[PDB]
Amino acid sequence: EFKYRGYTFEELLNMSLEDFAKLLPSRQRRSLKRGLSPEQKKLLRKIRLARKGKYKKPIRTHSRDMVILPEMVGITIHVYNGKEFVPVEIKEEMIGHYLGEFALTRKVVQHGSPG
Amino acid sequence: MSDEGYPAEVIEIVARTGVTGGVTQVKVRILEGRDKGRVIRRNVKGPVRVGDIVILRETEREAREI
Amino acid sequence: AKALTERFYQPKELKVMGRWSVEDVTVNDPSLRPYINLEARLLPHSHGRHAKKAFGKANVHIVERLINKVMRSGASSHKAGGHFMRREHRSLMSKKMKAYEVVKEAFMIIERRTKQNPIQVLVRAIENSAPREDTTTIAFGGIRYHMAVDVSPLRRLDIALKNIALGASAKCYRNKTSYAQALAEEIIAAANADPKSFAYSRKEEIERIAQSSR
Amino acid sequence: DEFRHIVRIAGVDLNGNKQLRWALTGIRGIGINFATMVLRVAGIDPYMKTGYLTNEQIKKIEEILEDPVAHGIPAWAVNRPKDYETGKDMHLITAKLVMAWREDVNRLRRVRAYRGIRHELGLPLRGQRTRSNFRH
Amino acid sequence: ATVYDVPGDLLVERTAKALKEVEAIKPPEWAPFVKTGRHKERIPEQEDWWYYRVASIFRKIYIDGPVGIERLRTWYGGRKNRGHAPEHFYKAGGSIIRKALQQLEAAGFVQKVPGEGRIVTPQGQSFLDRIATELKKELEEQLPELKKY
Amino acid sequence: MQKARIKLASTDIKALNEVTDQIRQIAERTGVRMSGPIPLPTKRIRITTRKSPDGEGTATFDKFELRVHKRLVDIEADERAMRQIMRIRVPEDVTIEIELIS
Amino acid sequence: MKVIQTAGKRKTAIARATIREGKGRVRINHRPVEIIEPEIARFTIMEPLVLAGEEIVKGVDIDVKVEGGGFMGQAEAARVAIARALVEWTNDMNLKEKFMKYDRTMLVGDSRRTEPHKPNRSTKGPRAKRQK
RNA sequence: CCCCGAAACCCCCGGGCUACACGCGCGCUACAAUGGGCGGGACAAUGGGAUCCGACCCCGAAAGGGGAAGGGAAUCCCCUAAACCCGCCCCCAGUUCGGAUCGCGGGCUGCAACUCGCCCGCGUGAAGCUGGAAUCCCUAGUACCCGCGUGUCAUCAUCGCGCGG
Ligand SMILES: [Mg+2]
Ligand SMILES: [Mg+2]
Ligand SMILES: [Mg+2]
């Protein structure tokens, strides 16, 4: 019904990081295999707690280069676009993408006449 | 194909001519026809050295200038 | 070529390209005779050595002048056949080996036809493609008149070769005929003095414009 | 005999009588390289003309197209490797191909990603500038 | 007679045809696929391109002696159409030439100096010079000015 | 007998020549066999700056150049010769290097 | 073992020819002139030979090592080298003069080199300039 | 000189300078046969190299990956250039021309590649069939054509400065 690469979301969760990476594209795989930054790890553990706990707060961040994971699902993250923390409610089909793809920086242009 | 043209040998270069300097006024001497020695002055286009041979479609034009 | 003897042709006699002689070749235009070099020169190629002087062209072989004019790239600043041609990278500019083969194939062509020395054919073609009068505007006391003038034999050669090559180019442009074939056709046409030749036509038109101008 | 000015391969995508590899490039999803591959694995001459193609040869390349990797094609020479719903590495043809493109695009749109937005507005999305040289 | 005495392209095709009779010159399973380099645009259009390529490599190793894969890569490379962008030179893939060299070392025609690349063997230079003397005869029916050599 | 390479490099041909003449005259003061001052290819460090700060105006360039002349001298290694070539003055704008081939 | 060395230069191409008694074999980098694949290059190299004649070539053997720029430069440098070789092998001034009136550069060298490229669109040339 | 002066000084994160209905300059690729592809065959110079060049071997379809001789530079490497030639397919057409665009996948650099990098493979297959008025560069190893080096450089060259053919 969703089936990322023949795997359903339950399986994606029970998977480790290595095998999920094997399923990901080359770029995101490289990102993981190189490892996360401290800010990324702090965000991630906030997210762990929020699936557990409550975290007592919404999740905000400046990190647009964090690739989405099955653990980062069912959750709303507010990503900095340069001016605002814009909300991103994470569905299953964002699974291997960066947050910045959904937090946009430049608004669309509606041109005026030349002059 | 070579119509009634008359050879003419160049004997002396004179000043150059033309609005853009491409033309050279020259003194030439006919070699065949009826003149057979009548020098004449013509305005020739292109490079010339003495001894060159230019062939003319006529001989009674005779442009003159300083 | 696909015969292996044309591929590894070996010269022995000092004929032109080791194939065609020039002893039997004659030019009946006395104004061009001095300015047409017909020496027993195996390889036409000179390496620019003439241009630094003013009549080294006179000292230069004639088929060399042809191949150098064939190293063309079409027409960039003028319109032959009404068209700019402007081959930029797929030209022959600075490709004298290609030009040499083009000319050689052309000669082979006409000699398969024409049962003649192709160099004889070529001199005939430049003879009856080479004008005698042109027109140019001169000032007399400050007023311009489009007068008529006679053309020097070197300039006659230059024009003849140029427009031979240019006709070949226009005929080979964007059509199924080869450059060599266009060249052959142009040379024999001009030698027969038929108006199908771009070069004969052009000579006739500048000449009739002159005879109109005087 | 056995001549046909026109031949249907992969439905009624109908192909001229030139040499076969380029005739096959007449299909969407097939370039000259994939064509040469398919023919080399099916034992067919690529320089061959299409009029002299036999119905069994037609069937043969059709079934290769249906499952290329199973016949000898590598996995790195296909339209759609590592599909987003089945990890199978597969090669898609005309209609299934436009549908697959459409689907991945509108998936991106559904999640409101930069590429989907930039698709639906019809602008460049592969790093270009668009100021001076994208004018329509 | 020898390799330097005859031309190259004719020799390569003749010795390819002869290399088809050698059993250690099987093409690999990925031959009918892949191009010869990133600088290329299309698959080889021939079926015996493998034999042509190993023949070429064999001759190159005859001539240039202790040579290896990177040198051969730059010789088998060339120009790429980089789209709207200008043209540059790119080397070829190494797997073709490596597998070729290894096939030839199996057949006995080249050996592998520990350093400084690969070197033709006596049986290898014999093979090549045989084909060359043969060819030289067949085109000495033509040029006797080459019978000379 | 084992040999001694002397690679010496400068920016001044005359200092360079001075040193080589020191070596020649000292070897012939003794009798050890010199191997000539082999002149090696001289290095041309070229730096092509734009001579404008503004960025405005026509673009004009300064092609600055530094030249390094290089010589090598092989002389048989004796304790005497070595002691005295060590004693050499070796002026300031010159580098040397006494390797030994053995 | 009378052998004669000559040399030829043509814009970053140096040929070193050695001439000696033999049969008529002449080799450019181990390769016969007969099979040099661009006809033009073959003919550049052959001109002095054709011109001097088989009568002496057939007694001469030549070998040229040329280590430079292009096929044409190599061919010209070789032509020069073997022309000088023949002249210095024969001591025939009638031949020297034949060469010197056919092509003086056969015996004297072409001195031309490339002009250094200068700033405005320097990659193209010293006088090639950007468009206004 | 005026001003800021605890902010108009300093540092960090993120964005932007990379936005695009449009007008202009300089250029790259082309509009094909004076060619395209495939396979074979040839020939350079200038410069540069220490956490840097890296032969050579192995792995890989490629990009690339592992190990690594030698090399502080006439010793080793970058570095067997392309235009060119030979043979075979294409035979004047939006094509075996053209490669915009876009999809999927695979990689390198980097702390970070979404915004916003470069490379590879399969696939897609955009306009464009020589260009008005007008205008630019160039006099000999020059112009045109061909590629290479280096500067910028962690990775990025349709650029600059240069090199030869
Ligand atoms: Mg194409
Ligand atoms: Mg057309
Ligand atoms: Mg710049």
Structural domain tally of chain F? 1
The two tokens of residue C157 are 């050669």
Cβ count within 10 A of residue A115: 3
Q: Which residues of chain F between 24 and 83 are close to nucleic strand H, CB under 7 A?
A: 40-41, 43-46, 48, 59, 61, 63, 70
Beta bridge partners of G16: G7, G65
Distance CA E43, CA D36 (A): 7
Q: Which residues of chain E between 76 and 135 are close to nucleic strand H, CB under 7 A?
A: 76-89, 91-96, 98, 101-102, 112, 114-118
3-state SS assignment for residue F32 = coil
- Residue among E117, E118, E116 at smallest CA distance from E108: E118
The two tokens of residue F31 are 């009798």
Task: Answer yes or no: are the C-beta atoms of A41 and A75 closer than 8 Å.
Answer: no
The two tokens of residue E107 are 């057949």
Helices E49-63 and E69-76: angle between axes, nearest 10 degrees? 120
Task: Answer yes or no: are the C-beta atoms of C181 and C106 closer than 8 Å.
Answer: yes
Dihedral over alpha carbons A71, A76, A77, A82 (to 10 degrees): 150
Distance CA D36, CA E103 (A): 25
Distance CA E72, CA D15 (A): 41
| Residue C69 contacts strand H, CB under 7 A | no
- Residue among B65, B52, B61 at smallest CA distance from B8: B52
Distance CA F20, CA D107 (A): 80
- Residue among C185, C174, C194 at smallest CA distance from C109: C185
CB contact residues (below 8 A), chain F span 23-62, against chain G:
59-61
Q: How was this structure determined?
A: cryo-EM
Residue numbers in E near D72 (CB within 8 A)? 29
Of D46, D47, D74, the CB nearest to E33: D74
Sign (positive/negative) of CA torsion E136, E142, E143, E147? positive
- Resolution of the coordinates in A? 2.8
- Per residue, the 3-state secondary structure of B19-35, as one string, reads CCCCEEEEEEEECCCCC
Distance CA A38, CA A32 (A): 13
3-state SS assignment for residue C57 = helix
Neighbouring chains of A at 3+ CB pairs under 8 Å are D
- Residue among D72, A85, C193, C96 at smallest CA distance from E33: D72
The two tokens of residue A9 are 């979301």
The two tokens of residue A4 are 């990322």
Give the C-alpha distances (Å, rounded to integers) separating E116 from E68, E70, E99, E125. Answer: 7, 11, 18, 19
Beta bridge partners of F88: none
The two tokens of residue C202 are 């052009």
Neighbouring chains of B at 3+ CB pairs under 8 Å are C
Tokens 């070749």 map to which residue? C25
Sign (positive/negative) of CA torsion D120, D124, D127, D129? negative
Close Cβ partners of A26 (under 8 Å, ≥ 6 residues apart): none
Task: Answer yes or no: are the C-beta atoms of E92 and E101 closer than 8 Å.
Answer: no
The two tokens of residue C140 are 């007399």
- Per residue, the 3-state secondary structure of chain G, as one string, reads CCEEEEEEECCCCEEEEEEEECCCCEEECCEEHHHCCCHHHHHHHHHHHHHHCHHHHCCEEEEEEECCCCHHHHHHHHHHHHHHHHHHHHCCHHHHHHHHHHCHHHCCCCCCCCCCCCCCCCCCCCCCCCCC
- Residue among C151, C145, C159 at smallest CA distance from C213: C145
Distance CA D135, CA D113 (A): 24
- Residue among C127, G42, G113, E147 at smallest CA distance from B3: C127
Task: Answer yes or no: are the C-beta atoms of E134 and E109 closer than 8 Å.
Answer: no
DSSP line for E70-132: HHHHHHH-EEEEETTEEEEEEPBPSHHHHHHHHHHHHHTSEEE-SSS-EEE-HHHHHHHHHHH
Q: Residue F2: which CATH number?
A: 3.30.70.600
Give the C-alpha distances (Å, rounded to integers) separating A71 from A14, A74, A75, E97. Answer: 10, 8, 9, 47
The two tokens of residue A77 are 């993250």
Residue numbers in G near E148 (CB within 8 A)? 23-25
Q: What phi, psi does B35 have (nearest 5°)?
A: -70, -60
* Cβ burial F20-37 (10 Å sphere, 16+ → b, else e): bebbeebbeeeebeeeeb
Distance CA G16, CA G11 (A): 15
Sign (positive/negative) of CA torsion A52, A55, A56, A62? negative
The number of residues making up chain B comes to 66
The two tokens of residue B1 are 């194909």
**Judging by DSSP bridges, how do beta strands G26-28 and B39-45 pair with one another?**
unpaired
Distance CA A72, CA A4 (A): 15
Topology (CATH) of G1-132 = Ribosomal Protein S5; domain 2 (3.30.230)
Query: Which of left, alpha, beta for G85 (phi over 0: left; psi -120 to 50: alpha)?
Result: alpha
Distance CA D65, CA B45 (A): 73
Sign (positive/negative) of CA torsion A48, A50, A55, A57? positive
Distance (Å) from the alpha carbon of A5 to chain D's nearest alpha carbon: 5
* Cα of D87 vs its chain's centroid, Å: 19
- Residue among A78, A74, A113 at smallest CA distance from A90: A74
Give the C-alpha distances (Å, rounded to integers) separating D119 from C194, D83, D116. Answer: 62, 21, 5
Distance CA F5, CA F98 (A): 6
Distance CA C46, CA C62 (A): 11
Chains D and C physically touch (3 or more Cβ atom pairs below 8 Å): no
The two tokens of residue G95 are 């031949």
Sign (positive/negative) of CA torsion E16, E17, E22, E28? positive
Beta bridge partners of F66: F45
Neighbouring chains of C at 3+ CB pairs under 8 Å are B, E, G
- Residue among C61, C41, C40 at smallest CA distance from C50: C61
Write the DSSP symbol of residue C50: T
* Cβ burial C28-66 (10 Å sphere, 16+ → b, else e): ebebbebbbbbeebbbbbbbeebeeeeeebbebbbbbbb
C172-180, long-range: CB within 8 Å, 24+ apart, which pairs?
A: C173/C74, C173/C81, C173/C83, C173/C85, C178/C105, C179/C70, C179/C102, C180/C102, C180/C103, C180/C105, C180/C106, C180/C109
Q: What phi, psi does D81 have (nearest 5°)?
A: -85, 145
Task: Answer yes or no: are the C-beta atoms of D94 and D12 closer than 8 Å.
Answer: no
3-state SS assignment for residue E41 = coil
Domain ranges of chain A: 1-115
Distance CA E72, CA E61 (A): 9
Structural domain tally of chain B? 1
Tokens 């040998």 map to which residue? B9
Distance CA F34, CA F19 (A): 14
Task: Answer yes or no: are the C-beta atoms of G57 and G49 closer than 8 Å.
Answer: yes
Distance CA E80, CA E41 (A): 8
Instruction: Give the range of the structural domain holding residue F48, as residue numbers without chain letter.
Output: 1-102
In the Cβ-directed half-sphere of B47, how many Cα atoms lie within 13 Å? 11
Task: Answer yes or no: are the C-beta atoms of G76 and G110 closer than 8 Å.
Answer: yes
Of D36, D41, D47, the CB nearest to E43: D36
What is the spatial order of strands in the sheet that F38-50 belongs to? F38-50, F61-76, F3-10, F94-101
Give the C-alpha distances (Å, rounded to integers) separating A72 from A4, A28, D112. Answer: 15, 15, 17
Instruction: Report CA(E22)–C1'(H66) in Å, whole number.
Output: 33
Q: Taking CB atoms and an 8 Å limit, are E148 and G25 in contact across chains?
A: yes
Give the C-alpha distances (Å, rounded to integers) separating C107 from C3, C115, C186. Answer: 17, 11, 12
Distance (Å) from the alpha carbon of E106 to chain D's nearest alpha carbon: 27
Helices and strands per DSSP (H, E), number in chain F:
2, 4
Tokens 């490339």 map to which residue? G114
Q: What phi, psi does F68 have (nearest 5°)?
A: -120, 115
The two tokens of residue G48 are 């002095």
In the Cβ-directed half-sphere of E100, how many Cα atoms lie within 13 Å? 27
3-state SS assignment for residue E64 = coil
Topology (CATH) of C1-214 = Ribosomal Protein S7 (1.10.455)
Measure the N-to-C terminal CA separation of chain E; round to a whole number of Å. Answer: 7
Greatest alpha-carbon span in chain E: 52
Chains C and G physically touch (3 or more Cβ atom pairs below 8 Å): yes
Greatest alpha-carbon span in chain F: 66
Instruction: Report CA(E68)–C1'(H49) in Å, whole number.
Output: 22
Protein contacts on strand H: list nucleotides below 7 Å from a Cβ: 13-45, 47-48, 54-64, 69, 74, 78-92, 96, 98-125, 129-132, 135-149, 158-165
The two tokens of residue E45 are 């259009």
Tokens 């639906």 map to which residue? D120
G70 touches E at CB < 8 Å: no
Give the C-alpha distances (Å, rounded to integers) separating G106 from A100, D94, G45, G47, G87. Answer: 72, 67, 10, 9, 11
Dihedral over alpha carbons C71, C74, C79, C84 (to 10 degrees): -160
Distance CA C68, CA C96 (A): 7
Instruction: Report CA(D127)–C1'(H155) in Å, whole number.
Output: 16
Give the C-alpha distances (Å, rounded to integers) separating C65 from B45, C57, D21, D87, G40. Answer: 20, 8, 46, 68, 16
Chains B, C: CB contacts under 8 A, how many?
83
Distance CA A80, CA A96 (A): 19
Domain ranges of chain E: 1-149
**Judging by DSSP bridges, how do beta strands G26-28 and G31-32 pair with one another?**
antiparallel
Give the C-alpha distances (Å, rounded to integers) separating D105 from A98, C96, D113, E34. Answer: 17, 53, 10, 30
Q: Search chain E and give the residue with CA nearest C3.
A: E142
Write the DSSP symbol of residue D111: T
Instruction: Report CA(C87)–C1'(H128) in Å, whole number.
Output: 15
Dihedral over alpha carbons E91, E95, E97, E98 (to 10 degrees): 130
**CA of residue D31 to ligand 1 center, whole Å:** 11
| Residue G127 contacts strand H, CB under 7 A | yes
* CA angle at C88 for the pair C82 and C94, rounded to the nearest 5°: 110
Beta bridge partners of G65: G16
Q: Residue B63: which CATH number?
A: 2.40.50.140
- Residue among C47, C2, C49, C40 at smallest CA distance from C20: C40
Distance CA C23, CA F67 (A): 59
* Cα of A101 vs its chain's centroid, Å: 9
Beta bridge partners of G18: G5, G63
The two tokens of residue F7 are 């690679």
Tokens 């969760």 map to which residue? A13
